[PDB]
Amino acid sequence: AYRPSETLCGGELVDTLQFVCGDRGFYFSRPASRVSRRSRGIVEECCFRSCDLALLETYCATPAKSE
Amino acid sequence: MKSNEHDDCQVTNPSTGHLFDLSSLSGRAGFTAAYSKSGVVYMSICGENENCPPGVGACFGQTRISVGKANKRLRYVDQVLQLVYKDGSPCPSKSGLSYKSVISFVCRPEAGPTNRPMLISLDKQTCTLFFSWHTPLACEPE
């Protein structure tokens, strides 16, 4: 089986987020916030480059919000 | 007959001659189990599920990622009916890795709320999903 994208921009990206961050919350695209947490991530990275689960998992929503 | 094991989802127990047929649980529609809040997993026993790309035995229904091709390699390992699926889709966690669903059937003669694919855990690094299923169909009466 061969697919044109090893990294399905959109599909694999948002599904992996929703998969393990369904409960935690998933948002790698942040326009703004009064917390100044407006930093988008992984979108262009994991679209064109190969990524590891660590990146997306430790990103998820906010890195220290389960604490 | 040669081997109590068969690549037909049916295994005979060498201790009491109990023939476990898991084809009785087979199906094309399969069974739907809830995983992530906004996601369900499609799973068909010994067959392929039609809700996901042809050949798929296990698949999450959000984007339709395959976590196991519809194989039928059932193994009987110490009262445990193992139905292992492999050759899924490349696991995004590690580029080039593949998903795998391990179906583990356990004897539950009293039946109950355990007669449903119970996700034990997902081995995070190896993209291996473990599934429990407690049913009296998978039991040999001692």
Swiss-Prot record, chain A:
It comes from Homo sapiens. The record marks 24, 34, 37-38 as: Important for interaction with integrin. Transmembrane segments: none annotated. Residues 1-28 are annotated as: B. Residues 29-40 are annotated as: C. Changing residue 40 to E: Slight but significant increase in integrin binding. The chain holds residues 25 to 91 of 180 of the full protein. Coiled coil: none annotated. The lineage of its organism: Eukaryota, Metazoa, Chordata, Craniata, Vertebrata. Disulfide bonds join 9-47, 21-60, 46-51. This is Insulin-like growth factor 2. Residues 41-61 are annotated as: A. Changing residue 37 to E: Does not affect integrin binding. Defective integrin binding and IGF2 signaling.
